[PDB]
């Protein structure tokens, strides 16, 4: 995995996660309303992942939630036709929870990954320099 590889630049590791979030597919034979109703449980689960310290899965899942209600679901064949009482509360939740939480998780992931990347590169540098010294000696 890209996101797990400490040698990979922190920005690419985070992008791999948001890419996985974006991959969510809309089933055109599920009524749009079911997606809106499911939003509550998706939010609950993303919160639980975060509280477990599973910030990668929390970040992926907020990205899915956002991708769904912002990008994919409005393209559903029955979307424009659908009467969705939940839409207002979903907009509110996107603003209150999903966006700011995902943004905060992004910052946290970047920070952790940067620490890992820095420490790794420092170790590998010292090792590579040692090898370069030894290849000179011989």
């Amino acid at each position: 995995s890209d996101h797990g590889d400490v040698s990979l630049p922190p920005e690419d590791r985070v992008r791999a996660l948001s890419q996985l979030g974006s991959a969510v597919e809309v089933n055109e034979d599920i009524p749009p309303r079911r997606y809106f109703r499911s939003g509550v449980e998706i939010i609950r689960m993303a919160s639980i992942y975060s509280e477990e310290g599973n910030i990668e899965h929390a970040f992926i899942l907020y990205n899915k939630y956002i991708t769904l209600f912002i990008e994919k679901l409005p393209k559903h064949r029955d979307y424009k036709s659908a009467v969705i009482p939940e839409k207002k509360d979903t907009v509110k939740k996107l603003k209150e929870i999903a966006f700011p939480k995902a943004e905060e998780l992004k910052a946290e992931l970047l920070k952790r990954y940067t620490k890992e990347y820095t420490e790794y590169n420092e170790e590998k540098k010292k090792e590579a320099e040692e090898l370069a010294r030894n290849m000179a000696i011989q």
Binding site: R15, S18, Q19, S22, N63, I66, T67, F69, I70, E71, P74, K87, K88, V91, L94, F99, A102, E103, K106
Partner: peptide
């Protein structure tokens, strides 16, 4: 309803930033 669609559309750029 117009105002909700309009709110969703205004978050497109913010999603773009999230994915950056």
């Amino acid at each position: 309803e117009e105002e909700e669609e309009e709110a969703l559309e205004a978050m497109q750029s913010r999603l773009a930033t999230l994915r950056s």
